[PDB]
Write an enzyme that holds these catalytic residues in place. Structure first.
Site, PDB file in Angstrom:
ATOM      1  N   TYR A 142     -30.720  68.027  36.762  1.00 42.60           N
ATOM      2  CA  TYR A 142     -30.624  69.234  35.943  1.00 42.60           C
ATOM      3  C   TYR A 142     -31.877  69.979  36.390  1.00 42.60           C
ATOM      4  O   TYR A 142     -31.793  70.969  37.113  1.00 42.60           O
ATOM      5  CB  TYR A 142     -30.674  68.925  34.441  1.00 42.60           C
ATOM      6  CG  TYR A 142     -30.515  70.187  33.615  1.00 42.60           C
ATOM      7  CD1 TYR A 142     -29.314  70.905  33.625  1.00 42.60           C
ATOM      8  CD2 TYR A 142     -31.587  70.716  32.904  1.00 42.60           C
ATOM      9  CE1 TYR A 142     -29.194  72.121  32.954  1.00 42.60           C
ATOM     10  CE2 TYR A 142     -31.476  71.931  32.222  1.00 42.60           C
ATOM     11  CZ  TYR A 142     -30.276  72.626  32.257  1.00 42.60           C
ATOM     12  OH  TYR A 142     -30.157  73.821  31.589  1.00 42.60           O
ATOM     13  N   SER A 156     -24.650  73.482  36.314  1.00 39.12           N
ATOM     14  CA  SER A 156     -25.360  74.692  35.872  1.00 39.12           C
ATOM     15  C   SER A 156     -26.767  74.721  36.527  1.00 39.12           C
ATOM     16  O   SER A 156     -26.728  74.761  37.906  1.00 39.12           O
ATOM     17  CB  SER A 156     -25.431  74.719  34.344  1.00 39.12           C
ATOM     18  OG  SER A 156     -26.050  75.930  33.972  1.00 39.12           O
ATOM     19  N   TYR A 157     -27.885  74.604  35.814  1.00 40.75           N
ATOM     20  CA  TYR A 157     -29.184  74.589  36.499  1.00 40.75           C
ATOM     21  C   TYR A 157     -29.173  73.450  37.515  1.00 40.75           C
ATOM     22  O   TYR A 157     -29.751  73.564  38.589  1.00 40.75           O
ATOM     23  CB  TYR A 157     -30.346  74.371  35.515  1.00 40.75           C
ATOM     24  CG  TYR A 157     -31.673  74.860  36.069  1.00 40.75           C
ATOM     25  CD1 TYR A 157     -32.354  74.142  37.052  1.00 40.75           C
ATOM     26  CD2 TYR A 157     -32.192  76.101  35.683  1.00 40.75           C
ATOM     27  CE1 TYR A 157     -33.514  74.653  37.646  1.00 40.75           C
ATOM     28  CE2 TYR A 157     -33.338  76.621  36.270  1.00 40.75           C
ATOM     29  CZ  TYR A 157     -33.994  75.899  37.251  1.00 40.75           C
ATOM     30  OH  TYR A 157     -35.103  76.453  37.851  1.00 40.75           O
ATOM     31  N   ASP A 190     -15.667  81.162  33.237  1.00 42.89           N
ATOM     32  CA  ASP A 190     -17.034  80.837  32.825  1.00 42.89           C
ATOM     33  C   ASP A 190     -17.759  82.126  32.432  1.00 42.89           C
ATOM     34  O   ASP A 190     -18.131  82.930  33.291  1.00 42.89           O
ATOM     35  CB  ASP A 190     -17.802  80.173  33.969  1.00 42.89           C
ATOM     36  CG  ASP A 190     -19.070  79.488  33.497  1.00 42.89           C
ATOM     37  OD1 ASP A 190     -19.718  80.003  32.561  1.00 42.89           O
ATOM     38  OD2 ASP A 190     -19.425  78.439  34.080  1.00 42.89           O
ATOM     39  N   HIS A 209     -17.636  77.366  30.989  1.00 41.63           N
ATOM     40  CA  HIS A 209     -18.764  76.578  31.472  1.00 41.63           C
ATOM     41  C   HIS A 209     -18.665  75.069  31.235  1.00 41.63           C
ATOM     42  O   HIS A 209     -19.208  74.269  31.993  1.00 41.63           O
ATOM     43  CB  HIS A 209     -20.062  77.084  30.859  1.00 41.63           C
ATOM     44  CG  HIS A 209     -21.276  76.599  31.577  1.00 41.63           C
ATOM     45  ND1 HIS A 209     -21.546  76.942  32.886  1.00 41.63           N
ATOM     46  CD2 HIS A 209     -22.254  75.740  31.204  1.00 41.63           C
ATOM     47  CE1 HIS A 209     -22.634  76.312  33.288  1.00 41.63           C
ATOM     48  NE2 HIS A 209     -23.083  75.574  32.287  1.00 41.63           N
TER      49      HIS A 209
END
Ligand SMILES: *C(N)[C@@H]1CCCN1C(=O)[C@@H]1CC[C@H](CNC(=O)Nc2ccc(C(=O)OC)cc2)N1
EC number: 3.4.14.5
Lengths: 726, 726
Positions: free
Chosen positions: B509, B592-593, B670, B702
């Site tokens: 992450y 995501s990140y 998303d 998402h």
């Protein structure tokens, strides 16, 4: 021995095909462009002179992507700032170069962002469309006369087609037609007012912070269709102070009763134009022949001069009613129509007589009428050797239909079995274009005796390059399904051994009137698969296929997604039984209609195929455009064909994909077969718990043809097939 | 031995974790819901009674997805017709059931499509938002009082947050705050008037002929941000004839000078509210303490009563300024702020004094303040054993900061090292929630002596099921990079043999203040990979990581995409050198990140990783929202941080992907990390001629959390990793 035809060879085009694209400017001369300059050739002797030097525009300051010389030979239209739109449409900037004074015309220039431009058939008049309105220039350096004022982006189109008319009926962006000597300019006006919009994201360059939403008037099956009007203007009666008057030609009543289309416009003479209209239920069409009324200024289309063309077994025409070819006096015409036996042949009409006379007949079809003299009618057909995939030029004596001579059949039967032709202005000469099965061959001939004048291009250079490579061979044959013969072709690996079992890839399209089995010479992805990977690439023309009569073509009427997919399975079944096929390694792939058939086959539960690839497939007919879909499916209503529309989707077959390896590919900016179609396939597969492979191509349209995307997709597909077969 | 934890076990949740979710309704009782009915428990003795029978609503005629009992115990709010919006937002229908008369209230019912509803803190007043406007109900069966009239879809939000405030600042859809005894209702109003719209297609069910375009006010980095206003209304001074009057609290001037945000609102007393504001450059924040003026009716925030909180090394707060905890009289408060050494500890403030006094200190951090009595302050920290990934509850004597007692550290050190807590209304009792490293354990305690009352749930049932399965183990340790220690965790396959070389998957992450190395017990995809596939799944907390002081967390200030990705590579490098790792089989994946870091790592050209998977990754910061992105990156302007914004994209590293196997995954709907982000990655890869794998998920957001999509994505990712490692 030496090397094979590799994927890189295909993607980098290492083995180039030479063409000989000429443009007839008279009945005796043609222009032949080169990488640099344009030459003018004398057809009789073959001698040439430079028409215009390449350096001429060294400092034009703009990259010129195309030229267009006035019929006059007096001016040259320079096209630049080309920006592609749909399949045929685009905008550009234009400059006119005066070949007389060797000077660039700088005054009253054609505006930028012009949508369409075209010279008159004879002089040097110009007609162009800008901001959806039509403009006419009587002289290159003079001010333009505006012809229409109703043009409105995405709503009113004057002189140009809207999305569906461009893609499905005129196969062009242009919707204007000059009369023979340039006196009249006829044009269509389209109104998309209530046509729904398809909307999709366009990401553009990385620098764009927010994606843009593209919206285009696109009528899907059963939706509100655009409407059309037709007008004719006299370009000799325009002032500059008066707003020119366009005379509208309406009706017929049999059309106005409901939704309809304008499907053809063909000028017969200086003062007579023919129009063909088609009902939304493309079962019935009507041709009107209209005459200019001297003292009235308007156009009258006498009933009794109109002809009805309908079908009881399917739709009218191959894709639309055929165009007429009028005799010099415009009092009679020839046109291709379906026989009483269902075969398309040339019928001869008297403009004011209802019954026509077929001049050709037989269990083969006339592909097209190429030229008409007061002496003969030249046409291309697949009569020779009874091979539907072959094309040859013939001429029939108008005085005696018994006298039909083939002009290309015997020129070189081994190397040439597929021809196209290009006649000079008065058909005094003609260039023959052989495209297979051997290397393409371009030749010139004189019509008086049909004597071969000389060879224009024989691709000897390419021939030399290929003798040092292990190329695949091509087999064209047929199988028999309950009485009827259906043709197929196979690209065979080099040194083909019928005792060996090869993996097989079924290359499919199979849309109505399609033909994938022919004698054309091609250098493509299949060439690589066979040559380098030793894969047999086959194609089959089953029910729904064209050029073999209506019994076959209309077999899928109102029933897309049935017999044409079943026949591909049956074909694979027979192939896997010829002895040289590994029935454990049979795959299938197609693009668009082929993507649909590939998907329907993969979900049929037949179990014949191990894997398959669908590129930009249609997944359910209600998602595709009205003109095309409805032509074969009728309307998606309970009263018409809704049940079959619902029964022929790919999504309903999701469960069956558990038995195959599937690769789904689609361009995100596909304005034709919307990404939506693959988006629904993937969702159905996910909902049933079926694993598969996928690849989207950002901002690519239906062709996924950008240089980088093209190389990437074929590279990706190559890995997939190899994995499936290894 | 027996079986392993399979993918199906994970996807079908065959091994379920038991929880004990209670809800305190007083300082002595709590409600404990069951699959059917709700019980009321006496914390002191543990005895219970049925609060409301499950059958009670057998014929409600609607599927009830949630209940909410008034603080009164007199009414029950029934929520149904739940329709999810974003991460926290949703709409629903509500019905109020009178527990007194055991009757459903049928008059003046809360409207359908209600956006938010909440009881007052004490009585049974109701405040709800519908069509972006606030309404107040003093009695369940009485007519509602409208509080605002400016509500306008996608433009003006009263009492609810817009997209960015919901996701990035309040982590909630609610933007209203009742005063302690329900007298006042404070609320925020957001204006998205000039905020740009993100637009994307939503395909919906197969029956939708034309895709719809979803558009939501979403400010990307550097774009126009929504503005905010704050108001407070006296719900005891409303008529039904007069339009209630909302008193606006504006400023401070230090904020009004430019773009700013409202980042916190906390009531101190019945007549005192605190507000925290943050400049768009999240380097500086200001807290205002406002008092109700009896004879004026308005609210005054005395300067000198306001406190500044700023940072010279980075942004303020972990994700935003921390919330204050006021003493009973509201004249002082405790709050977590960064030390002079960069460690977040509890500081004690006098509302009208600028300097605060730290009551805790050390090289560890206070995670949060959980409760405050006039006697003690209860808080959770990672002080124990100096393990940043551990969590324990402590209590500090307000009379002597020297006296700090850990309340959970020693309860069961082997099984429990990570706790969360839940205190009763007056902190007379508290439930401890152990979540690892052993099976989750829920217990009850009394605060007077901190005596353990009893075990609420020990997951003995799950324990019994797991002894018959080969489960992986978990290792929590650290490595040392130039003086500093950085923690990591590894999910180890059963029967781990340090002499054997295992393939390794780096689960990442790595976003600012993140923590992926902890003592929490989890049953997830990684459990399957280790147990069944024998893959080591590791996670590492490098620079930018949280809960270890600012030197580490602020290391990536104004430089996202640098040290946090470099540290993941370095970690993998050290792992591949511990002896039990196959350096030929190291992969990386994140969401995501994590998808961004995975992509940045795969494109670093480090060559350490063979393959990787990026799910819904950020690809360039200008595409992500303003509040989050700018907090760490500043503004994308030449005067600020534009150069690094341009230097930290995934697209610029496309060429380097030639050395790895990449799988790119993204949901098309998303609304958070727009599909656009992956669309630009794929285009850059295509333009450089790099082959990769992709998967889009139609209409998934998402979370790609629909039951079918969830199973499908993990199944797809499993095949990819296994292929990469096999
Ligand atoms: C992906 N996580 C995107 C990309 C950059 C920011 N972003 C967000 O969703 C922001 C982060 C803060 C806010 C609310 N969402 C979360 O806090 N999400 C989250 C996701 C994963 C973890 C994790 O793995 O923790 C160990 C934590 C929090 N929107």
């Amino acid at each position: 021995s030496r090397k094979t035809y590799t994927l890189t060879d295909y993607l980098k085009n290492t083995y180039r095909l030479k063409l000989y694209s000429l443009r007839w400017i008279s009945d005796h001369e043609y222009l032949y462009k080169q990488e640099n300059n344009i030459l003018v050739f004398n057809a009789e002797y073959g001698n040439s002179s430079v028409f215009l030097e390449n350096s001429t525009f060294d400092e034009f300051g703009h990259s010129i992507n195309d030229y267009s010389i006035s019929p006059d030979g007096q001016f040259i239209l320079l096209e630049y700032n080309y920006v592609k739109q749909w399949r045929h449409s685009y905008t550009a900037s234009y400059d006119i170069y005066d070949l007389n004074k060797r000077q660039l015309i700088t005054e009253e220039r054609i505006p930028n962002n012009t949508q369409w431009v075209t010279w008159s058939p004879v002089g040097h008049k110009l007609a162009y469309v800008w901001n959806n309105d039509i403009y006419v220039k009587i002289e290159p350096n003079l001010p333009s006369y505006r012809i229409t004022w109703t043009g409105k982006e995405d709503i009113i189109y004057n002189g140009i087609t809207d999305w569906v008319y461009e893609e499905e009926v005129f196969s062009a962006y242009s919707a204007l037609w000059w009369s023979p000597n340039g006196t009249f300019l006829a044009y269509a006006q389209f109104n998309d007012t209530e046509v729904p919009l398809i909307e999709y994201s366009f990401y553009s360059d990385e620098s764009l912070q927010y994606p843009k939403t593209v919206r285009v008037p696109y009528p899907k099956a059963g939706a509100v269709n655009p409407t059309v009007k037709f007008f004719v203007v006299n370009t000799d009666s325009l002032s500059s102070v008066t707003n020119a008057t366009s005379i509208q030609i309406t009706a017929p009543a049999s059309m106005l009763i409901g939704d309809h289309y304008l499907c053809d416009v063909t000028w017969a003479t200086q003062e007579r134009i023919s129009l063909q209209w088609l009902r939304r239920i493309q079962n019935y069409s009507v041709m009107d022949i209209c005459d200019y009324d001297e003292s009235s200024g308007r156009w009258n289309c006498l009933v009794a001069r109109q002809h009805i063309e309908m079908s009881t077994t399917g739709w009218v025409g191959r894709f639309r009613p055929s165009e007429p070819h009028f005799t010099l006096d415009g009092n009679s015409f020839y046109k291709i129509i379906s026989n009483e036996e269902g075969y398309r042949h040339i019928c001869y009409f008297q403009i004011d007589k209802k019954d026509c006379t077929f001049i050709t007949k037989g269990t083969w079809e006339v592909i097209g009428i190429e030229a008409l003299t007061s002496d003969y009618l030249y046409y291309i057909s697949n009569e020779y050797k009874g091979m539907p995939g072959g094309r040859n030029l013939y001429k029939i004596q108008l005085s005696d239909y018994t006298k039909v001579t083939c002009l290309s059949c015997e020129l070189n039967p081994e190397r040439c079995q597929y021809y196209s032709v290009s006649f000079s202005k008065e058909a005094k000469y003609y260039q023959l274009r052989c495209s297979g099965p051997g290397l393409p061959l371009y030749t010139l001939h004189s019509s008086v005796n049909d004597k071969g004048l000389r060879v224009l291009e024989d691709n000897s250079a390419l021939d030399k390059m290929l003798q040092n490579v292990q190329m695949p061979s091509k087999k064209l044959d047929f199988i028999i399904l309950n009485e009827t013969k259906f043709w197929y072709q196979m690209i065979l690996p080099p040194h083909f051994d019928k005792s060996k079992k090869y993996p097989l890839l079924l290359d499919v399209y199979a849309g109505p009137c399609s033909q994938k089995a022919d004698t054309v010479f091609r250098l493509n992805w299949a060439t690589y698969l066979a040559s380098t990977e030793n894969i047999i690439v086959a194609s089959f023309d089953g029910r729904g296929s064209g050029y073999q009569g209506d019994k076959i073509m209309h077999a899928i009427n109102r029933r897309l997604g049935t017999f044409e997919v079943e026949d591909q399975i049956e074909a694979a079944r027979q192939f896997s039984k010829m002895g040289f096929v590994d029935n454990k390694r049979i795959a299938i792939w197609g693009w668009s209609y082929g993507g649909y058939v590939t998907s329907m086959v993969l979900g049929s539960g037949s179990g014949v195929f191990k894997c398959g690839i669908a590129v930009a497939p249609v997944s359910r007919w209600e998602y595709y455009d009205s003109v095309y879909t409805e032509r074969y499916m009728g309307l998606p209503t309970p009263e018409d064909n809704l049940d079959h529309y619902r029964n022929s989707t790919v999504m309903s077959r999701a469960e069956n994909f558990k038995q195959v390896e599937y690769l789904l590919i689609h361009g995100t900016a596909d304005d034709n077969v919307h990404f939506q179609q693959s988006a629904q396939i993937s969702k159905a597969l996910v909902d049933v718990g079926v694993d598969f492979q996928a690849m989207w191509y950002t901002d690519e349209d239906h062709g996924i043809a950008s240089s980088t995307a093209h190389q990437h997709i074929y590279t990706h597909m190559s890995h997939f097939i190899k994995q499936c077969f290894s």
